[PDB]
Amino acid sequence: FLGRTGSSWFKIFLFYLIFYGCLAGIFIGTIQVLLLTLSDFEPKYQDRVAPPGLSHAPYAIKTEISFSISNPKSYESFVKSMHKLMDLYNESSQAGNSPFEDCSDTPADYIKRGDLDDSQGQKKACRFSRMWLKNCGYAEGKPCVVAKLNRIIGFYPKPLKNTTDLPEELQANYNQYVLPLRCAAREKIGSIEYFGLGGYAGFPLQYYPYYGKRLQKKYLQPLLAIQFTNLTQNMELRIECKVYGENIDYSEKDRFRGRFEVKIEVKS
Amino acid sequence: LDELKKEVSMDDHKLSLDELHNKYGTDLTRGLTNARAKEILARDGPNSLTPPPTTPEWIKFCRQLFGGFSILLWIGAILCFLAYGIQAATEDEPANDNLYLGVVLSTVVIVTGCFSYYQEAKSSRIMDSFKNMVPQQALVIRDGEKSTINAEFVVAGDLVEVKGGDRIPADLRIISAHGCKVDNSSLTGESEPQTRSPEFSSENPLETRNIAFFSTNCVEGTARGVVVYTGDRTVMGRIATLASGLEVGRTPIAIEIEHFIHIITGVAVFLGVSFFILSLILGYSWLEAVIFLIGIIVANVPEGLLATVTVCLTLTAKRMARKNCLVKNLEAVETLGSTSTICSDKTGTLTQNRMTVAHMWFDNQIHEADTTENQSGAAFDKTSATWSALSRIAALCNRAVFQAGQDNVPILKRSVAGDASESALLKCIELCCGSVQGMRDRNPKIVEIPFNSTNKYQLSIHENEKSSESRYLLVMKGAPERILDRCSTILLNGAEEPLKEDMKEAFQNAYLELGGLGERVLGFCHFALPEDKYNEGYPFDADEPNFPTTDLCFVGLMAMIDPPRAAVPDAVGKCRSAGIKVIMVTGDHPITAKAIAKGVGIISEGNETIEDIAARLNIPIGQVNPRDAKACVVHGSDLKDLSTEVLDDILHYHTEIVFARTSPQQKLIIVEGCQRQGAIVAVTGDGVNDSPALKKADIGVAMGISGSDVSKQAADMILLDDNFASIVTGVEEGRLIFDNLKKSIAYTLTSNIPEITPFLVFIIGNVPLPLGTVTILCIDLGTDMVPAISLAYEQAESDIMKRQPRNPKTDKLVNERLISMAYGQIGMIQALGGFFSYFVILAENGFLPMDLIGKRVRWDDRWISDVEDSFGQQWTYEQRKIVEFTCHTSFFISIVVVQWADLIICKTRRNSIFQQGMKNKILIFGLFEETALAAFLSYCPGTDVALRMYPLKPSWWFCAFPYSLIIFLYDEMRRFIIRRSPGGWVEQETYY
Amino acid sequence: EGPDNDERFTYDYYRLRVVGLIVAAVLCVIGIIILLAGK
Numbered sequence A: 001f002l003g004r005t006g007s008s009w010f011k012i013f014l015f016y017l018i019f020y021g022c023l024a025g026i027f028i029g030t031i032q033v034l035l036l037t038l039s040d041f042e043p044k045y046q047d048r049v050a051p052p053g054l055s056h057a058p059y060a061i062k063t064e065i066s067f068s069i070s071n072p073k074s075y076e077s078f079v080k081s082m083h084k085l086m087d088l089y090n091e092s093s094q095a096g097n098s099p100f101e102d103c104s105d106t107p108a109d110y111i112k113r114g115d116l117d118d119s120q121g122q123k124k125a126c127r128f129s130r131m132w133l134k135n136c137g138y139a140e141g142k143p144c145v146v147a148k149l150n151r152i153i154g155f156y157p158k159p160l161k162n163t164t165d166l167p168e169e170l171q172a173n174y175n176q177y178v179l180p181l182r183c184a185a186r187e188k189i190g191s192i193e194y195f196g197l198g199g200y201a202g203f204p205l206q207y208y209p210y211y212g213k214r215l216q217k218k219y220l221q222p223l224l225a226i227q228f229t230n231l232t233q234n235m236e237l238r239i240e241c242k243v244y245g246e247n248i249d250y251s252e253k254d255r256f257r258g259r260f261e262v263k264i265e266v267k268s
Numbered sequence B: 001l002d003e004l005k006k007e008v009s010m011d012d013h014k015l016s017l018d019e020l021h022n023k024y025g026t027d028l029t030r031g032l033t034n035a036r037a038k039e040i041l042a043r044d045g046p047n048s049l050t051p052p053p054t055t056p057e058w059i060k061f062c063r064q065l066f067g068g069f070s071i072l073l074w075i076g077a078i079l080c081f082l083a084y085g086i087q088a089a090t091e092d093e094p095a096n097d098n099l100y101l102g103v104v105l106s107t108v109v110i111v112t113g114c115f116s117y118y119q120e121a122k123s124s125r126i127m128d129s130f131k132n133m134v135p136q137q138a139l140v141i142r143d144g145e146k147s148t149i150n151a152e153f154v155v156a157g158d159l160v161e162v163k164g165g166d167r168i169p170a171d172l173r174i175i176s177a178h179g180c181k182v183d184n185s186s187l188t189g190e191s192e193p194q195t196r197s198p199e200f201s202s203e204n205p206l207e208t209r210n211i212a213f214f215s216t217n218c219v220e221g222t223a224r225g226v227v228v229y230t231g232d233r234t235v236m237g238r239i240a241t242l243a244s245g246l247e248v249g250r251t252p253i254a255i256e257i258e259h260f261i262h263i264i265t266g267v268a269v270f271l272g273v274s275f276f277i278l279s280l281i282l283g284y285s286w287l288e289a290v291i292f293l294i295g296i297i298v299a300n301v302p303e304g305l306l307a308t309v310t311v312c313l314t315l316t317a318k319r320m321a322r323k324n325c326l327v328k329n330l331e332a333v334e335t336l337g338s339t340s341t342i343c344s345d346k347t348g349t350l351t352q353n354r355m356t357v358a359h360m361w362f363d364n365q366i367h368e369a370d371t372t373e374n375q376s377g378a379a380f381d382k383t384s385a386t387w388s389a390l391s392r393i394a395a396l397c398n399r400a401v402f403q404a405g406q407d408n409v410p411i412l413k414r415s416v417a418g419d420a421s422e423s424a425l426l427k428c429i430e431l432c433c434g435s436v437q438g439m440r441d442r443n444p445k446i447v448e449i450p451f452n453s454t455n456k457y458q459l460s461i462h463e464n465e466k467s468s469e470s471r472y473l474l475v476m477k478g479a480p481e482r483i484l485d486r487c488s489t490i491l492l493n494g495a496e497e498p499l500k501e502d503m504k505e506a507f508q509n510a511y512l513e514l515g516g517l518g519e520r521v522l523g524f525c526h527f528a529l530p531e532d533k534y535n536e537g538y539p540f541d542a543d544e545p546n547f548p549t550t551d552l553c554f555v556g557l558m559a560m561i562d563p564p565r566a567a568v569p570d571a572v573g574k575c576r577s578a579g580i581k582v583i584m585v586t587g588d589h590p591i592t593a594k595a596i597a598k599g600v601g602i603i604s605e606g607n608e609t610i611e612d613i614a615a616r617l618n619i620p621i622g623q624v625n626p627r628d629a630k631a632c633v634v635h636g637s638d639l640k641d642l643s644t645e646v647l648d649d650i651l652h653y654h655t656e657i658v659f660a661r662t663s664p665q666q667k668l669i670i671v672e673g674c675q676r677q678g679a680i681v682a683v684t685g686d687g688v689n690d691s692p693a694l695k696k697a698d699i700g701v702a703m704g705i706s707g708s709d710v711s712k713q714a715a716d717m718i719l720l721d722d723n724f725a726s727i728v729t730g731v732e733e734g735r736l737i738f739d740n741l742k743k744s745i746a747y748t749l750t751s752n753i754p755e756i757t758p759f760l761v762f763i764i765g766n767v768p769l770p771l772g773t774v775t776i777l778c779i780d781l782g783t784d785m786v787p788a789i790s791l792a793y794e795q796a797e798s799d800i801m802k803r804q805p806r807n808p809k810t811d812k813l814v815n816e817r818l819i820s821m822a823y824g825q826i827g828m829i830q831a832l833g834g835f836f837s838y839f840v841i842l843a844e845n846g847f848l849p850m851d852l853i854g855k856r857v858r859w860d861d862r863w864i865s866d867v868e869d870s871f872g873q874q875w876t877y878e879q880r881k882i883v884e885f886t887c888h889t890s891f892f893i894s895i896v897v898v899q900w901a902d903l904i905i906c907k908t909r910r911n912s913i914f915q916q917g918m919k920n921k922i923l924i925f926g927l928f929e930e931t932a933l934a935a936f937l938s939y940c941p942g943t944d945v946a947l948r949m950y951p952l953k954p955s956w957w958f959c960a961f962p963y964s965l966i967i968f969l970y971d972e973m974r975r976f977i978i979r980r981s982p983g984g985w986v987e988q989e990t991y992y
Numbered sequence C: 001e002g003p004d005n006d007e008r009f010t011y012d013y014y015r016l017r018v019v020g021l022i023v024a025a026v027l028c029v030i031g032i033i034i035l036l037a038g039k
Ligand SMILES: *[C@@H]1O[C@H](CO)[C@@H](O[C@@H]2O[C@H](CO)[C@@H](O)[C@H](O)[C@H]2NC(C)=O)[C@H](O)[C@H]1NC(C)=O
Pocket: A086, A087, A088, A090, A092
């Protein structure tokens, strides 16, 4: 033929069949032992998610949400993702004492449901009403963005203490139980309005620590609705929403490390 | 074009002096007119040689920039700029990826260009050396007056004059001469002075006395002649053009390189476009379809391989430089290993090029002297009183002297003023009797008759050094038979005795044997003149026989020859044991050529020519079956009337071939004949008459000390110490580097698979990219470099000089067996070890292997800063990318770890590491430096930006260890099978 | 620890780099030693 005879062509096939078969069987074996060394409830390493990311619902083309108020299908793209998220926080999804629980309607302290063990059933998560998100189809004019803190197993988000000076200096400082979120731009051509649990501009600490998908399915993380009823129009406004805390940090590279990058433009 | 120049020349030495003048419109006495000479100048053109048109270095450099790998790397470099252009227009990408990768790849092409350019070097100044043989000026007779003119202004027809010490300015017809002798070594390779006279003495113009040639010099006397040829039209000017004009051609090693380039280029374009369409079918945007292709290019092309080859060659050439063997062309480092036929000059190559005493006949006994340079033999006789009598004649009846200031150099190597035979005798006595000058001071010469054409003897009368005599001793030497007709007694073991027919017959026997050995034989005799008949003041007349020259006492015979170099016989046998055919090709006479052939082992004992059979059986040569003769001796005059097909039959039908009295073109023809049969041929030589053959040879080797400038220009290799044993070393080195290149190539190729497979699974699996493009270049250009080079220092696995020369048609540098092992077996194991570490990194950070399938869409989505892992955690864009790049880093390090084992297995093709050992210090160096480089690239701060290399946790380093070990075991088991059964299965499938 | 389990999300990449570079250097020196056993 090309290389060899039929007899040789066969033998080279019988070899590579057994050979690659063995190699596949060995590869699988090493994957088995790897998995055997891992927990079902907690990942081996967590230093790469460490400082929590802050992500929002409006799916930004490039950290930007520009549209026209005087146009219907101009914002119907951002309403798709906005709906996708809030559709999960339905009351019909949170039914019965299992696996949900009614928690303080005001920001409270942490809740420990034991260890990362299966020695108990599904760890009961705090309910969250999308109805706590006042004012927010969504904002056809002047968007109503929804913030979110990235989930990390066993992470206890710790707010800053009012020992020294603060950006939003001491205003509504629920020091003990709220992780604040203050959006900014100089360039003050807007109108910041925050909505959340208990009416505070933060995340209620009663939703922590997260026990993971395996030990807490259907779990709901707290949301923080933000509305920009800015009196300006037809210009790119670089708005940055920042979260503050002891376990919260940022990076010049990762522009989502505990903060937002939104470029709103109501070009109408 | 040069087929005309490969033919024997035609001449006009047969014409009379007068007749020759009519042909050139010339005067025998007055010479040309100033006006007629200038007319002929403009007519024929200058008496000069024009160098052939060369290829500029520009075109030579750029021709390498387009050879398979460079072509693919160019397509990659441009395709980078393509994707970059498409980006800069569509979505403003502030990145530098495609732009920088395009710059990097273009640089890789340029630098790789320098390496191949350095390897494909051609240092040739043939025509320049020939031009150096034309004198600046010549002496001509114009308008009846002699004047010096620019030799280029010399034309056919003018009257030229030459004298001892000057170069022949052009081909001349001798019309007048006085004691003129010439050095025709340019045409023959033999430096013994040849007389020139107006008389025609041979039909063959290269042998007649009435022609003098350009490229030669007058050694003594004076001559006048008419110019018959000028410039390019001279006999050796044509040889110049032939030699300088010959197409170089591709080396065996070069052909091998291009061959695997085709193979690897083939699989590259195959998988390249095979997966380019496979991606579009899967619905991949052309934006991405090209990005994957660039990666495929980089994965398939072994970026550092061609440069490795060059370095391995260079390092092999450095070792040979250290044995006095200079390599002018890097590729010639290997040709000697692939050589199946050596065509060797005799004089100054196989031989020392110096008349040396070989045997002596005295006391009715043949004695042998030591002919070797360094005198590696033993003594023959010292005791016999006869010896001292013969020794005295050899010293006394000798007019040769050592040049001043030689006392530093060895006797046999020092320059001597005199003819070759007298120098030989001088050096013979000086060696075994001490200072000859002393013997010539103790015995003052009073009268002598120098060797005469008519007398055929030379005699001398000396004052006997003996005090009790202080009388007159007569000594003489000459033609053995002439000396015999002048002897009455023979000095036997001390005492004289009558010359009976018995001893006279033993003389003839001794004389015939020595002459049969191709040796020049001389007779020696002396006579103690009677005291009473010769007073202490008796005057001797040299002009008229004033003393007896008959009834003298015969002392002995001495024989001499230009002997082989000490190492030559043994080197010839070694070449022949390695299955190399050795042919002699010489301008010298057949009797001498044949005798040295037997001396060095070109013709082995018992082997006969058709002429030998005929003489032994006493029958006509036509009655001899030529197939009964494995040896042959072909004279150039017969070679001339043979067609190439008939030359091919001679080459095919004889194992032991001697081509004697060959011209320079004839040497070229013999070389081409050998090549025509498909053989790789080496030429060894030292003369300008070797230049065409040296050029045409696959590898020409010139002698460094004895070699002429031309020969060393025409060669690929120079033996700087004239050590012929270096050929044996060269062939051995050549074979070793050929095997080691295979090892180094397999090693380099093996790591291509773990660079290809990640890109494929990236498409077919939709997982995060396991390894990056930049990461690949860190391997092929970084870590693999020193290890790959180090394989050039591997010792032989067996006695390589015991095997036959490779068949260049069947035995390739890269074959299917190499690809099967490198791509199908070992590289495949490396790929898995890479993937394993990849799955380990991701799974330990929260992305278990199961959830990875079909996630790249969301993984690469820059706007999704919340991807969910297996444990329910959310990752931003840059966070997961850090883990991904950490995966690139550990996959990279996995390659390094699996290359550890590969380096050790590529060490040997057959033998076990437990047999070959670990005595390669460069290889071990490679292991340490490779690992140091990898660690540095991972842990050095800032490398995460420039190369996207991230720090690895200690446990990460050990992921591929079990795969590294399986490689070592697998290959060790496999080679154990090879050795345990030379049959073929494992052998014919995987044996590189 | 409980709410004070910050060490769980921390890794000393600084020490690892220092050690990694020490090792790389020493492997580089060791290599020179073995190579220079004859040049
Ligand atoms: C989650 O809540 C949303 C609230 O808008 C539900 O949307 C409803 O969709 C139905 C049918 O398309 C409409 O008739 C209603 O007007 C919507 N709102 C309400 C309050 O009922 C959505 O269907 C819910 N999703 C799930 C899975 O239950």
